[PDB]
A paper describes a structure:
The T3SS is a large, syringe‐shaped, membrane‐spanning, multimegadalton protein machinery. Here, we combined cryo‐electron microscopy, cross‐linking mass spectrometry, and integrative modeling to determine the structure of the T3SS needle complex from [name].
Regions inside the needle complex, which do not exhibit any symmetry, could be resolved up to 3.6 Å in a map without imposed symmetry (“C1 map”), enabling us to build the de novo atomic model of the proximal needle end and the export apparatus. As in the previously published structures of the Shigella export apparatus (Johnson et al., 2019; Lunelli et al., 2020), our updated cryo‐EM structure includes five SpaP[SctR], four SpaQ[SctS], and one SpaR[SctT] subunit. In addition, we were able to model the N‐terminal domain of the SpaS[SctU] subunit, which was not resolved in our previous reconstruction and also not resolved in the published structures of the Salmonella T3SS. The transport channel at this side is closed by the side chains of the residues F213 of SpaR[SctT] and M178, M179 of the five SpaP[SctR] subunits, while the flanking M177 and M180 do not extend their side chains in the channel lumen. Although we do not observe the long loop, the N‐terminal domain of SpaS[SctU] has a similar topology to the flagellar FlhB[SctU]. The improved C1 map presented here clearly shows that six MxiI[SctI] subunits assemble into a single helical turn before being continued by the needle [name][SctF]. The six MxiI[SctI] subunits build the first turn of an upward spiral on the distal side of the export apparatus creating interfaces with all SpaP[SctR] (SpaP[SctR]1–5) and the only SpaR[SctT] subunit of the complex.
Numbering used by the authors:
A (entry chain a0), L (entry chain m0), M (entry chain l0), N (entry chain k0), O (entry chain j0), P (entry chain i0), ...: 90 to 106
B (entry chain B): 1 to 73, 94 to 121, 131 to 214
C (entry chain G): 1 to 85
D (entry chain F): 1 to 256
E (entry chain A): 1 to 77, 94 to 120, 131 to 214
F (entry chain C): 1 to 72, 93 to 121, 128 to 214
G (entry chain H): 1 to 36, 47 to 85
H (entry chain D): 1 to 71, 94 to 121, 131 to 214
């Protein structure tokens, strides 16, 4: 999971945290 | 008092009275003309159709006073004469031919009178629509030539049509003309 | 062949015939006035609309009798079809 | 006395008539020839009940064994099956109405309502004419027999007194099927008018100071009506294609 | 005359008379045609439905006179056979064949009356569509002219009504239409 | 209680009460004015038409209270005097001529009510025309501003509604209009 | 029914003549200002024309309405 | 249980109940506000009138809970009316009817007119941000040169996202019910 | 059967069914989303409004079918649980406080559910309008770049949007996504 | 009649004067000028419209 | 009617401020440069526009809550 | 009734016949 | 009643005939 | 009564005839 | 009364006749 | 009173006559 | 009845036949 | 009340007469 | 009260008279 | 209250008179 | 009935046949 | 019945066949 | 019938076969 | 309350008077 | 509170007075 | 709080006063 | 706090006081 | 938090207070 | 399963995790 | 989390705090 | 059945097969 | 049946398979 | 069944699998 | 089922997984 991705989602932020 | 079977006939006639009036007197022309005027003015249900129907009913009672009083003191012949002088006899003759094969039966006169009156009322409505259609087209042309491609003319034509109908006196003179055509003879 | 489809095609044919002349006059007037405006650089849209209104009104005034005759013939044909439907 | 048995039989018959009417009324709604704007309510109900009586007395109505205890499940199943049947049988009329409406929008007569959804021209006339044309052609090509056969098939698949399960993934495609058919049928008019306005735009590009909108509207109207007239030879067989397609479609909706 | 059973049957039949007339006579066709024409004119409630329904009822009485006479002669003071023959004359074969039970002259008006009603509805709708054509022609012509003039914010409903009324008056409309319907239903 | 015939008369009068109010009791003016204001403000269903009819009925009842109180021949005479106060007498005389067969009598009840109704409708249209003027002025001004800005496809009615509403709120609107109408139809 | 077509012709001519004056003066103003914010001047001109010809429009329209009433008096 | 006349009064009141609610309670305010919001958002009929009317009816039922529980309750209803109506118009109607203790007949039209005026005022307040964003979109489109581009078909998403960010209906309903509650 | 009072309750409940469905079950979200997409396509009548309303009604009936089946009573608590599952609870708590985590009342829960559904539907509509706004802007930019500026992209964009939407089957995938968000397709 | 003609002329004159100043006083510069004029003259516009409406109300009350 | 006047003037001033920045940037590739400049200006100021509009909406909501 | 008229009314055609 | 008129009323045609 | 005009009023035409 | 002016009311025609 | 003017109100015509 | 005119009414076709 | 006025209300005309 | 001004209120006219 | 203003509120006119 | 070239004209077709 | 033409209504096609 | 027909029709194809 | 500014709300006029 | 400012609320006028 | 800033909320004016 | 941010917020003012 | 004009949520102001 | 692209279904994110 | 500044998600702000 | 006009009716495909 | 044609009707695909 | 194509209704992908 | 394709087609993603 990147931080400068083109599209994210609550899944992405929750997994990154 | 009254006889037994004559009582039954009178009760039946009074039961069918509203439909007989709705399909057998001048109420048709007045109702149709007033509804046509209301539609032409552009209003949806402002004139409170109960009021228009009541006015038409009172005018119909005024028209039918001579025949009603003639039958009150055999008015069937007078009613037949009224229908004959206010209908097209070709349709009546066709409906007479629709039977087995100058009597003009009452059953054969009612549809002819109804259709003739509806046709006359439609002609009157067309004659009424012309000034309002002219006003609508004139105001639409003025708005379009001004340079506006929006602001539908129906939002501005209502005051002009209303003031035109007020200046013409509208309903009063129209009712006078109709009743003069019908009873003043 | 399928009298209903025949009547529908007849109605569309009458529509095209009736709407041919006024539409053609309107588009010819519009194109001509647009070309004139392009040539002489006036940039005004009221003149084409006014002349279009005059032309369409005149054409519709002139063609009323023929319009009515054709429509009455068509309606009589429809009534004849109704007589033996 | 046998009068009691006669009364019992008649009341059971009336109950079955009520059930068939329960199934038939949505069909009598989604159908633009017996629409509830031309048939009076004092004539519609007796006709519906007579049709139900004829269908049940012809022995074309299937009944199970009254499996489900609660009648509410049965009632809602009947309502939903009736809605599905009405949607299946209203597809040709709806798709032709859509074709007419989009052609009208292409012409520009209803563009006023397209811009402002509050005022303008929200009622289409060419669409109504197309709807009536398709309705009468379907009706006179054998529509009534097909409708009654579809009702019989619906009774055959899911009987009145039983529980049946539906295919959600197959009934969720109705809207896209409708849109696809509409776009397919109206493609010639759409492309002709689009190309016409593109060409007029090119003309305006080479004619800078000119109003192109009114000319575009005029030519769009004339070309659209001409194309519709010359296209009045590709409409009849679509009714039979819809017959077959809708029959197999409504067949492939339940867990048969 | 009607001791204790013919009286019950007659009263039951006369109580079912409204629905029997409204779903087993020529009233359906006339009512549907009149309503459809009134809607095709562009109007909504200008002619009251009572007037059209009364005219349709009178025309239905005119059509039904021979069978009514036969029924009054036979039952009250054979009519069923005449009514069945009338239905057979004015029904569609396919609908009756479908309403027949199964296994490939249709009778049993119990199974024939729905077929008659559906055939009447179909024919009335066909007549209405036929009568819609000149009015839709006027509407489309007006719409095309209005679009040509450049005005698009006003619907052609405002201007279509007087022209449709003029066309119907010139055609004479109701009289010739009723004559056509009566001629269709009376040949002998 | 009441006699046999008086009971019939009062029951018939109460049965015809809605149509007697419809024929005219100053309710026509209030209803027409309120519906016209609703149409002018650009609203189609917001003011809840039944609410306008209710307040119009309350105002009409308030106006008719002197008639009801002075009633209970007195009530009929007072009603005729009120009608003659608020009608156009020439049309009443014309209807008298149409009913009977130029004179000078008190008046005829059946010949005066339609005249009052038509005069009330005419006055209602007059007040409606007076009311529409500021709203149409605002609409035209906003349309001119939008067009002079350069936009060609911006509907003025999309933005005219808030300005019309705030102007009508600043005028205090409905209260002042009701006061004006009731002052027209009240004495002193 | 030649009176019907006559009335239609009257309506068409009345519409044309009523639209002739304001649209014509607007066109004249537009061409005059284009020969060398046109909308403001055009609106001022059409408003002045409507103010000047309001009485004439009203009287002509009332005369036409009276003629229609006379026609439907016994038609 | 109501034998002679209370039965007649109850039946009459229940017959007139919907009209009384529509023209004598707070339902008019909420209904008008909701319809005004729907018109402002550039939507023809997307929130169907049944849903908005049901929400307004439920809110009115919540507001009228103390009035229902009071029933003697006529005096409480009169106090509520005088609390939320305009007293000057009530006084004028009282003077017109006759020749403290304001009459109930006088209070109803005054309350109806006051509620209509307040609903129009709050609707005008709600229209302002949508008018602003619509005009901004139209101005930027004009600046870009898209003169013929429709601003209505492009400003609806912005209006909707703004109303979503504002939480829209929830906060609006909270504000209205808080204005009409807390005694 | 329904002897004396259950009959009255059942008849009243059936008579209030239209308003209950309109202000209650999932019909609101489906109807609003469908109308929003129809407006986003740029044409007001590409599908018939009755067709969209009927499709939304059928989907709502399918959603409520498990609730009715579980009711067999317990149906009331099942409906309450569904409402709690698919709405914000803060608004319901506020309404319940206005009336006067224990429980919730239907009267304090129905308006909150309706407002939450309206908010979610508007969010979906905003998320869906943007691609079509983009297509309209692209058409306008192309016309301006080519030089022709008096043309109206309104008539050009509608066929393009219609053909794209029907070619990629927007309606079917949209309906599947919505009903999958609510329940699980068999 | 008299007052009808007066009201019509007054409405036309109001249209004329309201269209006069903001138009009579660079599309972006034109827009900002229109906005400034609206901000400065809003009170005068509202007061003129309110006075006209008060004249209307007086005419209604007179009857 | 102080609140009405304040809200009207605030709306007019918000319109002025919102439509001042892009107009000044653009009016004060024949078309690509202008398009990209307007787009980047709006995108940079989109957040500020949204925050200001949301603040005004909160203000009007509070005002209608009060009365 | 000239033959070279643009559009002739039914009366004109009938008279010319 | 000129024969080269543009639009002729039915009265004009009847008089010319 | 000059002829250089469009469809004239019935009085004018009748007077000319 | 003038005759070379615009369209006049029926009063003008009936006064000229 | 004027005889040549752009507007001829009915009062003006009746005064002239 | 010219063979090439603007309008070809049914009466004209019947007359030509 | 000069005759050269652009507009003339009915009061102006009646006062002039 | 300027005489040559545009449309004036009835108060102004009745004051001038 | 200076005169020659385009509009004149009734209060200003009354005070002037 | 030489060649319509744009329309059908059923009478023309039957006359040709 | 030329082949290279317009719509060529079905009667023409059946005549060709 | 031709091969590169102007526009197909069911009768054209049926005759082709 | 200067009289050379057109912002002359009724409060300003009343104060000036 | 100034007097040369732009349009101001009635509160400002009342405070100035 | 400023004084030369444009139109402000009534809270600001009241706090200034 | 940005006391001169040219924007308004009730919370900002209440925090200023 | 940046304490500047990037994004001003209610949480941002509440935290910075 | 590159999630950096626009087409990143929830299946793609779950598999990437 | 970075100072994205585009629009901060509520989860992003809560994690940042 | 030429392959040009790459869209063909179902009859064409059935004849091809 | 071809493979590179732009039309791939379901019957064509089934026939190709 | 080449992959350089469009949506490619499930039959194509199922056959390719 | 190449990764560098156009449409996700959830069945294609399942096949690739």
């Amino acid at each position: 999971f990147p931080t400068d991705s083109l599209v994210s989602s609550p899944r992405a932020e929750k997994a990154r945290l | 008092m009254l006889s037994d079977m004559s009582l039954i006939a009178t009760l039946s006639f009074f039961t069918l009275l509203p439909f007989l009036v709705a399909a057998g007197t001048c109420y048709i022309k007045f109702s149709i003309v007033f509804v046509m005027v209301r539609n032409a003015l552009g209003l949806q249900q402002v004139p409170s159709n109960m009021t228009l129907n009541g006015i038409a009913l009172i005018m119909a009672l005024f028209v039918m006073k001579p025949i009603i009083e003639a039958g009150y003191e055999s008015g069937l012949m007078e009613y037949k004469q009224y229908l004959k002088k206010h209908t097209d006899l070709e349709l009546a003759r066709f409906f007479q031919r629709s039977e087995e094969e100058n009597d003009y039966s009452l059953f054969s006169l009612l549809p002819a009178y109804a259709l003739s009156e509806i046709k006359d009322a439609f002609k009157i409505g067309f004659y009424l629509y012309l000034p309002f259609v002219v006003v609508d087209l004139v105001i639409s042309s003025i708005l379009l030539a001004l340079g506006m491609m929006m602001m539908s003319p129906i939002t501005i034509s209502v005051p002009i049509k209303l003031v035109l109908f007020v200046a013409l006196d509208g309903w009063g003179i129209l009712s006078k003309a109709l009743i003069e055509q019908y009873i003043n003879i | 062949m399928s009298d209903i489809v025949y009547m529908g095609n007849k109605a569309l044919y009458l529509i095209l015939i009736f709407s041919l002349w006024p539409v053609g006059i309107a588009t010819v007037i519009g194109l001509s006035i647009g070309l004139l405006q392009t040539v002489t650089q006036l940039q005004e849209q009221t003149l084409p609309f006014g002349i279009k209104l005059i032309g369409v009104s005149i054409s519709l005034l002139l063609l009323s009798g023929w319009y009515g005759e054709v429509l009455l013939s068509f309606c009589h044909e429809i009534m004849f079809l109704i007589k033996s439907g | 006395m046998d009068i009691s048995s006669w009364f019992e039989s008649i009341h059971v018959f009336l109950i079955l008539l009520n059930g068939v009417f329960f199934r038939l009324a949505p069909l009598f709604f989604f159908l633009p020839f017996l629409n509830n704007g031309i048939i009076s309510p004092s004539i519609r109900i007796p006709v519906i009940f007579l049709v139900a009586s004829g269908l049940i007395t012809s022995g074309k109505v299937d009944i199970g064994s009254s499996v489900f205890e609660h009648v509410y499940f049965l009632m809602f199943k009947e309502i939903i099956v009736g809605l599905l049947l009405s949607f299946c049988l209203s597809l040709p009329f709806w798709i032709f109405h859509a074709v007419g409406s989009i052609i009208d929008n292409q012409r520009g007569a209803t563009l006023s309502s397209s811009i402002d959804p509050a005022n303008g021209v929200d009622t289409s006339e060419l669409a109504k004419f197309f709807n009536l044309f398709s309705a009468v052609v379907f009706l006179y090509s054998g529509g009534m027999v097909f409708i009654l056969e579809s009702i019989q098939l619906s009774y055959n698949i899911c009987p009145l007194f039983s529980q049946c399960s539906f295919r959600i993934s197959n009934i969720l495609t109705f809207l896209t099927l409708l849109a696809s058919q509409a776009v397919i049928l109206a493609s010639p008019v759409m492309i002709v008018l689009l190309l016409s306005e593109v060409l007029l735009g090119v003309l305006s590009r080479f004619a800078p100071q000119m109003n192109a909108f009114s000319v575009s509207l005029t030519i769009k109207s004339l070309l659209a009506i001409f194309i519709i007239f010359i296209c009045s030879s590709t409409i009849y067989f679509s009714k039979v294609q819809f017959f077959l397609g809708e029959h197999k479609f409504f067949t492939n909706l339940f867990v048969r």
